[PDB]
Design a protein around this ligand. Structure first.
Ligand SMILES: [Zn+2]
Lengths: 109, 104
């Protein structure tokens, strides 16, 4: 749990669970980091969907935010918005960790 | 085809309705253009329901398409939950402006 160099992936959308826990090669796969990169370069048309194996033992993942806005903006707005957004997401995660997780706000920030 | 893609991309409408449901949706993957009026929406009620404010719901909710909108309604006891509506046409600010002019 401290480290995991292999990544679980899906090949397409709509994979049933019964294939997911059974590790069906036609829908799911496990990729080593270097081997995952090699597969990506060697398959420019590959459809890959990163996921996890078992939430009971490996629920710990890095923090990631997705923003998909149907509006094309210039670079200046892009940069000011990204810096501001990381500022407020840091504030929110620190506030929640201090409230419940008991973590130090400065450390996570 | 139970969905008419003349209003909004089905993915965006599903994103909106999921955003309304603060609780996690269990079978989000299987909602397509040919089943969204049929399969009940089973929800993992970790948090209070975003519509009825209760601890959980005995029965799953369901979606209907009507008048260019999505009606969200609970199965079993109807009065036990609040009916919800998702619109698909008009910038909300344009509706507000139409109402304000409408007042003269
Ligand atoms: Zn409810």
């Amino acid at each position: 749990i401290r480290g995991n160099d292999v990544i679980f992936v899906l090949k397409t959308i709509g994979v049933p669970s019964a294939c997911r826990q059974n590790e069906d090669p036609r829908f799911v796969e496990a990729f080593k980091c270097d081997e995952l990169e090699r597969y990506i370069d060697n398959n420019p048309e590959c459809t890959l969907f990163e996921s996890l194996r078992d939430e009971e033992a490996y629920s710990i993942v890095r923090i990631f935010m997705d923003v998909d806005l149907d509006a094309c903006l210039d670079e200046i707005d892009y940069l000011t918005a990204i810096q501001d957004f990381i500022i407020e997401v840091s504030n929110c995660v620190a506030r929640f960790a201090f409230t419940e997780c008991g973590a130090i706000h400065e450390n996570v920030i | 085809k139970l969905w008419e893609p003349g209003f909004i991309s089905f993915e965006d409408a599903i994103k909106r309705v999921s955003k309304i449901f603060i609780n996690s949706i269990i079978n989000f993957n299987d909602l397509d253009e040919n089943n969204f009026t049929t399969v009940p929406l089973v929800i993992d009620y970790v948090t209070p329901c975003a519509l009825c404010k209760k601890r959980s719901h005995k029965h799953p909710h369901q979606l209907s398409l009507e008048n260019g909108a999505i009606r969200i309604y609970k199965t079993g006891n109807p009065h036990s939950c609040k009916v919800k509506i998702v619109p698909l046409d008009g910038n909300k600010l344009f509706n507000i402006a139409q109402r304000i002019l409408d007042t003269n």
